[PDB]
Amino acid sequence: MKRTFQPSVLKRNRSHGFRARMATKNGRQVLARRRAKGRARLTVSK
Amino acid sequence: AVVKCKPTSPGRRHVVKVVNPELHKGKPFAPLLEKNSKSGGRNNNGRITTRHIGGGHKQAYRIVDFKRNKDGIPAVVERLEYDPNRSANIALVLYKDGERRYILAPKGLKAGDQIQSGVDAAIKPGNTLPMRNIPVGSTVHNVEMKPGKGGQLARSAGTYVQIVARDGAYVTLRLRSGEMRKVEADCRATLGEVGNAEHMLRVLGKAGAARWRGVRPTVRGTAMNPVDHPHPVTPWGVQTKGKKTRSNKRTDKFIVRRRS
RNA sequence: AGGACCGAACCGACUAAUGUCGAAAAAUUAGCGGAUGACUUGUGGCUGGGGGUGAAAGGCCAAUCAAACCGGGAGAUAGCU
RNA sequence: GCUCGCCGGAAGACCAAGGGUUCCUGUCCAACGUUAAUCGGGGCAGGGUGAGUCGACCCCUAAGGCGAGGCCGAAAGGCGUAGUCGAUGGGAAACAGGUUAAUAUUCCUGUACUUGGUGUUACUGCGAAGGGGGGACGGAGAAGGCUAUGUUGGCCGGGCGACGGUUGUCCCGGUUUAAGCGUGUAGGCUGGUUUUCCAGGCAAAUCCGGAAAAUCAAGGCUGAGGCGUGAUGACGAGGCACUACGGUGCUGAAGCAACAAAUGCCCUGCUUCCAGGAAAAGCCUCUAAGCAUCAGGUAACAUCAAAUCGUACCCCAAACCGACACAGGUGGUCAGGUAGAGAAUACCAAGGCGCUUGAGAGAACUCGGGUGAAGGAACUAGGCAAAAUGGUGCCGUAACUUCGGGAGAAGGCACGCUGAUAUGUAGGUGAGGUCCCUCGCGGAUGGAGCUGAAAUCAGUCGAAGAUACCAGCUGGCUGCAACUGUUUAUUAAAAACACAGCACUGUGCAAACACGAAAGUGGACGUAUACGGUGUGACGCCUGCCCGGUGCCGGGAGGUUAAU
RNA sequence: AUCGGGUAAGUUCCGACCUGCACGAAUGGCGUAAUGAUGGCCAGGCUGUCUCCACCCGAGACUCAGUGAAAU
RNA sequence: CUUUAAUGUUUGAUGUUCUAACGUUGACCCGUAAUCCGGGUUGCGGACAGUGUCUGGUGGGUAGUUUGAUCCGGUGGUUCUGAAUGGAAGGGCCAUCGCUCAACGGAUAAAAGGUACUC
């Protein structure tokens, strides 16, 4: 069978990238929470 | 013409085709074409507002002129073409000045026929004339409710309306639905009845015809679970099967008689 | 010409066997139905939770669905173990 | 190193996506490899990815996203115009050989090509977010020309050979050469030249479109392949001299003809079908504003530049997704020889592997198979599973039927090899010579040569000649459903769901209906032959009675009836 | 969804009647060619399904060497 | 004052007509290389439609639940008190009355079923 996760860099970036998140305020709030938690990997990117 | 296919197999046993030998067997007129992206029943919100719509073969929109603003310009019918968007065949019309357009083809129209729009037009089929000039008791198609609107009544194949009464600046039209409507005299209309009146004879044969014509399968209410469907009422709870949904109170002044 | 016929790739799993702390959190062998379409597939998007989609099984919604997951009310309440 | 076995429409070679150095060398077995390991996709060090011609990048755009003003909404925010993004598409260009342990269409050798800037020369009107053409398109199907490719023959170099014969009609290997350039053919499309005029192409126009005429009947566009140059160059079997014995250098003969032939090109071609089959940009052309002693454009020459990013490695797998070095899944391209209708099947070439535990013995029992005395379903919920037929050609094929089907019904006979018909037939292809030629890739005769079924007779060996793999069991009765098809991913594939048809009902178009606090959308750039809902489910007979209760429609006689 | 056929033997199946608990005419009734990985029955062949199992070929099972879990 | 009538007044229900509010998903022009939107002209309806508050009816479509006691008080008498003073309303004191609210120590004034999809 084919598992749920089929990697695709373009789709991953466009669905969870910084620009995609910040296009809306909710993603900006998520980024703010991530920064407050101090995660080194703020988002998914190369 | 109407033909019945031999029962060489199921799916052709009951097929009845409507063949029009004089239709153009070639590419359409590119300048008047326009792309028509299918919607699949979705709206701006992307949800299915109307069901049973989807799939189908790609079809390019034909820019069919209905207002017929070319007044006093005689034109010749070059040929007839099939319009997937309309149930009736279209006609290519070339004017004297050297401009081509698409018009609704009435029953008595063929290649090489002469047409003329505007108030100064004859009574031959295909001409456009206001109901004030048109004699009472005549058959017209592609009628307008407002001057310059373009035409909204009797646009399908073999569809026509009857001019019954002339009350001053208004005219009474009996429609194919048995409805009497009052329309302003300044509006435009086309004489004759739309062509390809044999549209009923087609039966589509099998599921695939409807599937690729742009209709998806319909699921009966009984087969649906109580959560999905109320099961006579509509899926949204409205009592169908003999309940009037006409609530306008704005155009009722133009309503003379309701269907019977 | 054929939602035609037999049958490869492809799609799915109708039967039997093995596999249930297995090679696999539904797998493998031979048979099996379609195989020019109402077929399938690569890519990119749209439809987001009392909602989406559904040729409609209460089916699917990231191995979880008669109401997903994540954080909060919340140390909800439990005459019960 | 030599044997034995497997894949070979792959278990081979390229890639796309996905990984991020796993790629090569040196060095070690601390931990990993389900055992050992000197080995490795393990540990440490070094090296490795060269682009105007590949792709990304960049111009345009579909689905779709954002969205200046604007509409709407308590706020957040939702819709959307102009615009901007968005390849899954359209746009300019390279081929052959050689080389490292790792790069090559990037490096070297040879021959080229494409886009712009600058300068010279000779001419000339240029000039757009604007107009016109093209770009620019569906399904199915047949033929012809070809080609990649393979077979044979001639030619070249070698061999005559350890178990009988093999200088002979014998055996082994090669017999390759691109892009570009010129000729432009098979084929396909279209009638051209000139003049005059027109409220059409949201202004104009020499451009398109339309209307008139005079003239010829040919011209114009597209177009695979082949032919010469590219190329007396590279490559090339084999031999020769040294080997850190892995390997390096020199040399180098022939490099042709016929046949067959593709899913690949002519072919976005041609013939038919209704389901009527993207858009924009580059590209050619016309002018508006503005300038026309300029600027700008055309044609030839010389020169400059074409930047930046990835270029290793795996890519049906040990490297990607499955927690694994996992019997699972993963898109495209090339894909040969014999038999075979076939990309099936049996064995092989090229190329790649023997799948990371084995050595003994051959107990019961388990897993997958082979055989079997006699019966042949007597075992079993149930012919579950097993067993059996299975192909080509010829004869023949019932009941019913919507006349198509049932049907490959059922049921009967020949299939091997050799000679003759025929020192290989029919058929296909087809040289040289001869004759014409509107003179070359032109047309007739001719059959050289090559390829080559099918059928009859006769003979012949075997128990069996569709001798292997591949390869329907058959008929009758009968309920269901018209049929094809889809469904509970991961126990239920069905009588269930769906379906073309049928009937009712609603909707007059700012239509009904649905998403929406509203805007605005789908319906529909459709409109009563149209769309939504309901019920049944082809076709024939049909669909009988009932309006009391609940809905729906219409009514207003008379009573009740809130806000006010 | 009682009588006869099929077997020597038939609560299944087929055909005939209706004593239709509780079929019935578009939540449709009656037949229907063809179709079905659809439910059931019968007949011809076939055979290890069985009378009744017997032997053989490969991997386990057993012994040795190296590594080396589990539920409880 | 009972009974009538021309005249000027408050006016409303209804009918015909008109445009100036209002709609125009009708047409033309501009912002604008613009199917959005706004503005200028005109035609079409027009005090209709539509919207805002209140209100009658329908409304498993949706949402929360179920499967003489009590509160309320009817009347009385009692100046006990009565929220600045004085009254009144509302409470308190004595009597009586309205429910087999009988599930009769009565949990709400107001509540029926299925789950084999279940937890």
Side-chain angles (χ1 to χ4, degrees):
Chain A
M1 299 65 69
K2 52 169 288 185
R3 300 302 310 117
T4 60
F5 178 72
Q6 297 296 345
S8 186
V9 177
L10 181 62
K11 295 179 66 172
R12 184 182 183 86
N13 296 333
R14 193 174 301 175
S15 179
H16 308 284
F18 202 136
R19 313 205 81 264
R21 295 291 191 181
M22 192 119 119
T24 65
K25 61 179 292 301
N26 303 326
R28 191 175 297 99
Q29 181 177 346
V30 173
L31 296 157
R33 291 202 301 268
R34 299 269 292 189
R35 291 198 183 91
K37 195 173 188 179
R39 306 181 72 92
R41 172 170 283 94
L42 182 59
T43 55
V44 300
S45 298
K46 186 178 69 176
Chain B
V2 178
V3 302
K4 185 178 182 180
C5 302
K6 290 189 175 183
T8 59
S9 297
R12 294 284 291 185
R13 166 168 278 94
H14 297 284
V15 165
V16 180
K17 294 192 298 182
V18 180
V19 300
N20 191 332
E22 54 270 6
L23 279 176
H24 178 59
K25 296 173 64 177
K27 304 298 186 63
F29 200 65
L32 274 288
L33 297 180
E34 178 62 14
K35 69 183 300 307
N36 187 15
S37 60
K38 296 176 179 296
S39 60
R42 277 65 174 178
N43 62 327
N44 55 17
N45 299 331
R47 297 181 178 180
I48 295 170
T49 57
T50 173
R51 305 181 302 177
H52 320 299
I53 297 176
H57 205 292
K58 269 185 66 175
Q59 56 185 0
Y61 180 84
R62 277 69 173 183
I63 298 172
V64 178
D65 181 71
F66 303 98
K67 58 183 68 177
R68 303 284 292 277
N69 56 19
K70 300 294 293 185
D71 301 0
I73 309 301
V76 183
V77 181
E78 183 177 350
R79 47 183 161 86
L80 303 175
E81 293 181 343
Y82 172 88
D83 190 327
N85 306 116
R86 282 75 171 185
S87 59
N89 306 123
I90 53 164
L92 179 63
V93 179
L94 168 58
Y95 294 79
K96 188 267 288 183
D97 59 1
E99 194 281 343
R100 289 186 172 84
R101 278 180 172 180
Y102 285 144
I103 307 301
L104 295 179
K107 179 179 178 299
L109 196 67
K110 64 177 70 61
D113 292 340
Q114 188 75 342
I115 309 174
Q116 185 175 9
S117 176
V119 65
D120 182 70
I123 312 302
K124 282 66 174 180
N127 299 330
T128 305
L129 282 167
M131 305 64 62
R132 56 171 71 268
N133 299 91
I134 292 301
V136 182
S138 61
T139 75
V140 298
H141 71 273
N142 191 24
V143 187
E144 282 173 359
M145 269 67 69
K146 301 177 180 297
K149 186 60 171 293
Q152 304 185 268
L153 307 181
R155 284 175 54 167
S156 58
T159 308
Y160 63 94
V161 303
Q162 203 83 16
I163 299 170
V164 301
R166 174 65 179 284
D167 53 321
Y170 284 100
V171 184
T172 308
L173 309 175
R174 187 180 69 265
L175 317 176
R176 284 298 307 262
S177 65
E179 199 283 339
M180 291 290 185
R181 207 185 191 283
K182 191 187 298 303
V183 182
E184 288 71 2
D186 297 331
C187 308
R188 288 182 173 274
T190 311
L191 287 165
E193 57 282 2
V194 186
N196 189 17
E198 288 67 1
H199 169 50
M200 290 71 68
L201 283 299
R202 72 175 57 267
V203 296
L204 308 176
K206 59 184 178 182
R211 285 300 314 274
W212 65 49
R213 191 171 300 274
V215 185
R216 298 189 67 265
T218 297
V219 182
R220 298 174 292 93
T222 57
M224 288 179 173
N225 292 115
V227 308
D228 305 326
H229 202 262
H231 300 167
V233 296
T234 63
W236 302 267
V238 184
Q239 196 283 340
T240 182
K241 190 71 70 60
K243 184 176 180 61
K244 316 297 159 289
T245 60
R246 164 53 180 277
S247 60
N248 194 344
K249 289 189 291 181
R250 185 177 59 87
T251 59
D252 293 336
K253 57 177 67 60
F254 303 149
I255 295 294
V256 183
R257 295 181 63 268
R258 187 62 59 179
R259 303 195 312 273
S260 301

